[PDB]
Design a protein around this ligand. Structure first.
Ligand SMILES: NC(=O)C1=CN([C@@H]2O[C@H](COP(=O)(O)OP(=O)(O)OC[C@H]3O[C@@H](n4cnc5c(N)ncnc54)[C@H](OP(=O)(O)O)[C@@H]3O)[C@@H](O)[C@H]2O)C=CC1
Ligand SMILES: NC(=O)C1=CN([C@@H]2O[C@H](COP(=O)(O)OP(=O)(O)OC[C@H]3O[C@@H](n4cnc5c(N)ncnc54)[C@H](OP(=O)(O)O)[C@@H]3O)[C@@H](O)[C@H]2O)C=CC1
Lengths: 518, 68, 135
């Protein structure tokens, strides 16, 4: 129901955006609770210490997972934006939810009269249990606009001073009518805002401030203003205002069950996922988290260097872009002519702006000296991590038309190039972990008029097979037809990249992938 | 990344007379109109057309995955 | 500076501000203009901006305001000084202190004045109605 690109910050591939808060051991062994813009559901989170609090000894790590997001947003909405002061009156929608509970906790500390809306009667009983200060007249219904009459009647027609709103459409309009003179409106829900629903400006004749509270901004910008909220939460924790919510703990392997429980909407409090258990020791200084099985997907170290031969080709640019998205920060692309088209220039400029250390080389892998120079350039950028041979020169025609020169021309960048790459890698590439050469189904199935291309492609496979048998990496991918850039329909680029991601992690030597027509 | 489709446009102005004036015939028989996009000012101008305040929202892919 | 000026009677100030701010916008807007100008001013706002509205026409007519501005962190205000005279004196003493501090510091300067004698109040009203007065 929500597009992954909506989250601020340029996250790539829309992968792992789930999760915003956690609670676990620090690198040094200290219990800490944090707040991450995304990627919080994981066995390890990379975070800045500014977004990390401390878990007091009274608390258990389970309780800590409930505090960060809800209490930070509540403090930012009320104290920083709404400038709440003692004695005011607040209408806090959806009291049962985490933000509502934190807002009630903050308000009752200052002594304000709190109106809350709850969908059902069990939630009403729960809230009455948690906060005795609430009276029977402080509860309204959140599933209809009846709360407006409640607030208006019990406030003598004056209204409310603050409104922490999360409802939508007709409920939002009803919320505004509760505002009093000098009252402030704190919009945290993001439905009407996304839909650009109109808001009559007549409410502003009454001195009124219409705030839009979005905490996602802090995680990615406005770092200076964050310390205010961090200090507020720390002060609340040490003073006792911040009280953890009740947590429904789900184990790691049952995360789908946790998502379903949340979706049903019957939960009260917070749902947490127990990746690992808490140990009695205060500072375990543990080495690693307990290992777990996870689907294997490809990633690259930041300090290694990769060589894409024929990187300016149609598939080479997409392969490089895929590699950059997986953590490559120094790339070497090879081409006889160099950058000679607008698309290539655009891609290289964008990669350089992103921080990638792209480099275009004219070294020809056909000659051994050229291959050694190419590997030396890669070394200058850093240790060679992977070699991809995507070079191709095509000379089609039936055998009666073919000639030795055409065969030599077709074979040089694919057959000789792979031999030289294998030699130089076996010589001076100890850290290499990928060595991929792209073949065609014409090699396996066969296609008329491409005899030399098939010979070249079949010759690359043998080198890869030998490399694997001796312990060194190697993989030849027999592709069909690449579409965006036989009897087989052309294959789209995204499917090709997904398949390539699968293939890299298999133990076999030669693999193929193609799409059957009809 | 991904395909974004228009959802809102704040203002569109069309002036066919200026449109005809701005068109200039290329060395071929085909006509052309130069287009300038200014993201700072949120204005797209081309010929006698002038779009301002274009809003695009990411539409989830159909995931037909007709290729298996 | 010479680049600090725009035209108030036309809605062309939006391009001026957006161009000269690098496309970001302005953090604080103090607007007293009509409907189309008021809408144009909103689009000048930047993230964490604050729209200080002191006009009445759009407020009185209850004209619509798109809520997409809120997704950008924003704070629309309604600024009516008349509230102080009716209530909230404790809130007024803060403004009084600010004004006195400005007077003693030197920030407050008197404005250029055109004086009409008591017997010529009608002439003063007509002169103000014309709209050519400065100060
Ligand atoms: N601006 C921002 O950055 C933030 C925005 N928010 C928004 O404010 C709200 C509070 O956040 P959060 O603590 O996560 O809220 P929760 O998800 O914990 O609670 C949502 C509330 O919605 C009602 N509800 C009941 N059943 C459902 C259901 N099946 N689906 C949806 N709602 C249901 C309940 O109120 P009731 O008991 O009355 O039925 C419930 O308390 C959320 O809508 C959140 O998006 C808050 C935090 C951050
Ligand atoms: N896309 C497809 O349909 C399929 C292709 N393949 C293989 O998969 C890869 C996909 O790349 P593809 O899109 O075909 O690339 P192109 O055919 O578009 O171009 C090949 C690339 O290699 C470079 N190159 C060509 N000749 C040489 C040479 N002698 N020495 C060094 N570099 C050279 C080209 O630049 P320049 O010419 O300037 O040197 C270009 O960068 C290739 O290895 C191809 O053989 C196989 C099956 C499917």
């Amino acid at each position: 129901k929500l597009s992954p690109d909506a989250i601020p910050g340029k996250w790539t591939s829309q992968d792992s955006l789930l999760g915003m808060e956690f609670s676990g051991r620090d690198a040094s062994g200290k219990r800490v609770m944090g707040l991450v813009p995304a990627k919080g559901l994981a066995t390890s989170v990379l975070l800045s210490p500014d977004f990390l609090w401390d878990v007091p000894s009274n608390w258990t790590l389970e309780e800590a997972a409930s505090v960060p997001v809800v209490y930070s947003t509540a403090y930012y909405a009320l104290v920083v934006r709404g400038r709440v002061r003692p004695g005011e009156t607040l209408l806090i929608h959806s009291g049962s939810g985490g933000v509502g509970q934190a807002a009630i906790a903050i308000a009752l500390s200052l002594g304000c009269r709190v109106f809350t809306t709850v969908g059902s009667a069990e939630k009403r009983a729960y809230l009455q249990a948690r906060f005795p200060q609430l009276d029977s007249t402080s509860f309204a219904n959140s599933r209809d606009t009846s709360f407006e009459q409640h607030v208006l009647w019990h406030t003598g027609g004056k209204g409310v001073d603050l409104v922490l709103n999360s409802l939508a459409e007709e409920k939002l309009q009803a919320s505004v009518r509760c505002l009093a003179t000098h009252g402030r409106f704190l919009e945290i829900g993001k439905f009407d805002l996304s839909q650009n629903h109109p808001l009559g400006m007549a409410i502003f004749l009454k001195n009124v401030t219409f705030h839009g509270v979005l905490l996602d901004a802090f995680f990615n910008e406005s770092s200076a203003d964050w310390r205010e909220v961090w200090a507020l939460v720390q002060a609340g924790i040490r003073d006792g205002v911040v009280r953890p919510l009740k947590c429904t703990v789900f184990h790691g392997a049952q995360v789908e069950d946790a998502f379903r429980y949340m979706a049903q909407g019957k939960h009260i409090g917070k749902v947490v996922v127990q990746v690992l258990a808490e140990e009695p020791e205060a500072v375990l200084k543990g080495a690693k988290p307990k290992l777990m099985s996870a689907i294997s997907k490809t990633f690259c170290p930041a300090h290694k260097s990769y060589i894409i031969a024929g990187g300016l080709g149609g598939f080479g640019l997409e392969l490089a872009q895929w590699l950059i998205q997986r953590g490559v920060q120094k790339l070497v692309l090879t081409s006889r002519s160099g950058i000679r088209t607008g698309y290539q220039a655009k891609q290289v400029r964008r990669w350089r702006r992103q921080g990638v250390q792209v480099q275009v080389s004219t070294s020809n892998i056909s000659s051994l000296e050229g291959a050694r120079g190419l590997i030396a350039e890669a070394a200058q950028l850093g240790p060679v991590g992977g070699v991809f041979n995507l070079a191709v020169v095509l000379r089609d025609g039936l055998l009666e038309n073919q000639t030795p020169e055409f065969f030599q021309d077709v074979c040089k960048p694919k057959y000789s190039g792979t031999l030289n790459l294998d030699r130089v890698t076996r010589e001076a590439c100890p850290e290499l972990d990928y060595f991929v050469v792209f073949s065609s189904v014409s090699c396996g199935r066969g296609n008329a008029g491409q005899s030399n291309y098939g010979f070249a492609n079949s010759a690359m496979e043998r080198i890869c097979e030998k490399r694997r048998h001796e312990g060194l990496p190697g993989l030849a991918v027999q592709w069909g037809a690449i579409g965006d850039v036989s009897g087989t329909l052309p294959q789209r680029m995204a499917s090709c990249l997904e398949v390539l991601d699968l293939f890299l992690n298999q133990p076999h030597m030669v693999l193929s992938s193609f799409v059957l027509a009809e | 990344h991904g395909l974004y489709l228009p959802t809102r446009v704040t203002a569109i102005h069309i002036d066919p007379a200026t449109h005809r004036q701005k068109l200039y015939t290329l060395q071929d028989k085909a006509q052309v109109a130069d287009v300038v996009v200014s993201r700072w000012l949120r204005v797209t101008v081309a010929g006698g057309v002038h779009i301002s305040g274009l809003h695009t929202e990411s539409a989830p892919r159909r995931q037909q995955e007709q290729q298996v």
